[PDB]
Amino acid sequence: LTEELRTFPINAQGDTAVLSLKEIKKGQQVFNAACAQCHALGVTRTNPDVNLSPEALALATPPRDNIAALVDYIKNPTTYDGFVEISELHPSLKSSDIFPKMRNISEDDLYNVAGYILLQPKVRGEQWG
């Protein structure tokens, strides 16, 4: 896994960040623990269109195709059109009541899961999402 594949847009301004492989291993864990229930393989079980594929992410509002945007999303989940807050029903830090796995999640983890999500299509191609 070259440093190239591990280079992702950290924000929407185009800035790049190189994540360590270790962080990605941790992102996967958090992901497999708190997201795989409805997102295994980068899909969205109950909403096929709003996937974890680059295309879907890029077309979200705002685009969720960069680490910052993905981190924001977990901290403050919103519908695809991004105008209705769904933190009450979607896993988030203010939703840890009905989502036990969100009680010990830290920014570092959010950062890692974000890198993990963005990594998958680079390595699994269209198998992801």
Q: Note whether 27 and 116 are within 8 A (CB).
A: yes
Q: Is residue 98 involved in binding ligand HEC (CB under 6 A)?
A: yes
3-state secondary structure at position 78: strand
Binding residue (CB under 8 A) for a copy of itself from 45, 100, 101, 123: 45
Q: Is residue 2 involved in binding a copy of itself (CB under 8 A)?
A: no
Residue 2 is labelled as binding a ligand: no
Give residue 9's region: left, alpha or beta (phi > 0; psi -120 to 50): beta
Residue 35 is labelled as binding a ligand: yes
Report the interface residues with a copy of itself, using CB under 8 A. Answer: 37-38, 44-47, 79, 84, 86-90, 94-95, 97-98
